[model samples]
Target: PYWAYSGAYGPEHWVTSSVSCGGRHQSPIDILDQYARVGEEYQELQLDGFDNESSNKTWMKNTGKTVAILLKDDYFVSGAGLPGRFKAEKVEFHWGHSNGSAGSEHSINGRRFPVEMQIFFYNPDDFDSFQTAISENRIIGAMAIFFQVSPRDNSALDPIIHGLKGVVHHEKETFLDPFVLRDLLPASLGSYYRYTGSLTTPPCSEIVEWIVFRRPVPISYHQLEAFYSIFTTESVEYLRNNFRPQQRLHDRVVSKS
Candidate 1:
C-alpha cells in the first residue's frame, strides 16, 4: 500500500504501518540555528566528480510522491564533514501547492520554504548500495537544500523543470541531458547544520547524517507550478504538499561548520 502525505495513510499512520517510523532519531526536524553549536573540526562540504560531464546518463521520475532524479553513479563526496567517503545515489524534492504556503521538509527556526531538495549518498566502504546502507547507523549521508520562491527563473534548473512535463503521471520517467549537479547548489556550501536522523519515508531507518544548508536556492513561481501540476499514479489528483511534518529533536545536538 502507498503511504500519502495526509489522511489515514499519512505520516501520522506511518508508525502503525512500519514500526521504524516511530524511531527516536527521525529526520525532517526543525533546525534551531541559534541553538546549534559550531564544529571547529568539521571540514567544509566538498563534492568530488560533481562537475564531470562524462557521466551524462541521468533520468527523472514521478514516484507518486515527489520528483526524483537518478544521477550518474560516478559522483562521490569526502571531507571531515561526512561519516566517510559516500557515493551519490539519487536526488529528490518535497514541495507544496503553487500558492507557496508551506512545503519544505526541514525548516529553520519555525519558518518553512516552498520546496526542499535532498541528495542522498551512501558509504561505499561499508555498504555497496543505498538499500544496503539505509538499515545501519551513519551509513548514509544526505544534503538538504531549501528552495524559496523567486521572481527570477533559475536557468540551471530548466532541464529538470522541462523533464517533469513528460512525467506528469506517477511512475512515469524520462531521461535528462547531462548537467552539472554542483551548479544547482548555492555558492556558499561551507556553512550548514549537521545532525543524525532517519529517512523521512516509511521504514524510516535512523542511518542518515543530514547536512542542511544555511543558504537557499531560488526557483521561480513558474517552476513551482510545474511541480504542483504533476499528478499521482493512483489518480488524477495533483501532487502537492508532499512533505513530512517536522519531527522531534530529542537529545540530538545540531552542529554547524
Candidate 2:
C-alpha cells in the first residue's frame, strides 16, 4: 500500500482508488536534451469542428463538456492554418515549479517557465486510426504554449473556473456549458516551433507532431490561484510534472526554418 501511494500519491494512488491495476509498475521517465533535433518536417493536423451529442450518455458525460469546448473557436479557429482535419477531443494544461522555473514538463535551450497547455486531437480517419497510430506509437501531436503567470485577472477563464468551483478543494468538478476554446490560445498561427515527438503522457505513445510556440501567453495571479484552488496540492501533486521525459532524436528533428 505504501508503494502504491508513494511520492505525492497523486495518480499513483489509483491502485487503491480503483479495483483494478492496484500494483502496476510506474515511474516517470526523463526527456533529455538530445530529444530536440533539427530536421524532419512536422506533421500538420487540421482543426475541424467537434461533434456534440445530446444523449447525455456515460461516455458523453465524461467527455462531453470538453468536446463542446473543442468545437469553440479556440481549437479550430485558433490554429486554423495547420494541415489535416483535426477534431478537438480534449484540452488540458501542464506546469512547472515556482514561477521562475520551467513550467512545461519539456525544456528548450534549458530555460523553464511557469506553465504549458496541451490541446489533444484525433485523426478523423477514425478511433482505429488514432489507436493504430498509438499502437505503432505514431500518435499525431501538437504544441505546448508557454504562458507566464498573469498579473491581470482574466474574465475569460471565469466560466471554467466557476464551473469547477464546488470541487475546488475536494475534487475536480465538471461544468456543463459556456466553455470557449478560442480565448485560451494564441492569436497568430505563425509563431510556433514545429517538431515530432510522442504523447507527453502514458502509454507515452510516440505519435505526435509538436508545435511549441516561442511566445508565452499572459494570465493573472488570480487565475493561477483559481486553478490552484481547484487543483489544490493534491491534483498538482499527482501531476508533479506528469510530462514524459524527452525522447531520443533518433531521426526526428525540430523545424524553425
Candidate 3:
C-alpha cells in the first residue's frame, strides 16, 4: 500500500501493488532530442489567470514522499494548441539529492535536471473534476518545467521555498502568499515537447497529455538546499530524490513545437 522511491515498495514493485502500473504508457521518460519530431502545428500554450500580483491564497503540503502545492480552481488553460479547456488542479515537485546528482523525473537527451515541477489540469469539457478526469483519456493535461542551479536566486519561488521550512515533516501544511505563476515558468513558452503518458505514481493511469518545456528555470543553490532539507514522514531521512525513473517510450512519438 505504501509506495516509495526505495525499499520493497519501490517503483519496481508498483505493478504488483496496482495493475495500472504495468501499463504500456508510463510517464517520466527520457526525451531524446533526436527522436523528437518538429511539429509546426503545435501552437503556443495559453495559460489563463497567470498573474504576478495574484492575491489568491494557496496551501503547500509535505506528503512524506514529496512536496505539493494546491492551487485554486479558478486557474485554467485554453488555446488552439490544446485539445480542450482544462481547469487547474494542483502542482507538485520532484527533485534529487542535495548533492545534485539527478532529481528530475524526465530527462532531455539523457540529461537530468536538479528539479522538476508539474502543474496538473483537468479537461472541463469532459470531466467535472480532476479526480474524474484521471480515469478518462485526454482528460488530463500537465505542464512540466525543469529547474537548474543558478548563481542568481529566483525571487518568484521565495514564497514556496520559505513555506518548505514550515512543513519539514510529512502531512504538515502551510499557507503561501499569492505569487506570479508565470514567473515559475521559462520566458519562452513557445518551445516545448508534447507526448502522451501516464501518471508517474502507482495506479499509473494512461491519461496525461504531457507538455515539457524546452527551457529550464534557474534557482539558487541555496534554494535547492531548502528543498533537500525537508524530512520524510516515515523517518528522519531527508526528503531528497523524490523522482521516478524514466520509462520506455513504447511506440510513442514526442512532438516538438
Instruction: Give the alpha-carbon lDDT of every model.
Output: 0.85, 0.46, 0.84
* Per-residue C-alpha lDDT of model 1 across residues 1-257, encoded as one tens digit per residue: 46888888899899997888898899999999899998658666668887765255689999988999988658888774676688989999998887776889999998899989999998889877787776655468888999888899998888888888889988999988667788778778877889999899987888788989888988999888888889985547888889988899999999988
lDDT of 2 by residue, 24-106 (tens): 22212222335534444544333334222212221111111111122233233223234455545556655543433454655
Every model: Cα RMSD to truth: 1.5, 7.3, 1.5
- Predicted structure 2, TM vs. truth: 0.63
Cand. 2 Cα-lDDT: 0.46
Native-referenced Cα lDDT, model 1: 0.85
lDDT of 3 by residue, 97-178 (tens): 8755589999899999999999998887787778877765555888899998889889998988888888998789998877
**Residue-level error in angstroms, candidate 2, position 6:** 7.4
* Model 2 poorest ten-residue lDDT run: 58-67
Model 1 lDDT, residue 30, Cα: 94
C-alpha TM-score for every candidate = 0.95, 0.63, 0.95
Let me know the TM-score candidate 1 reaches against the reference structure: 0.95
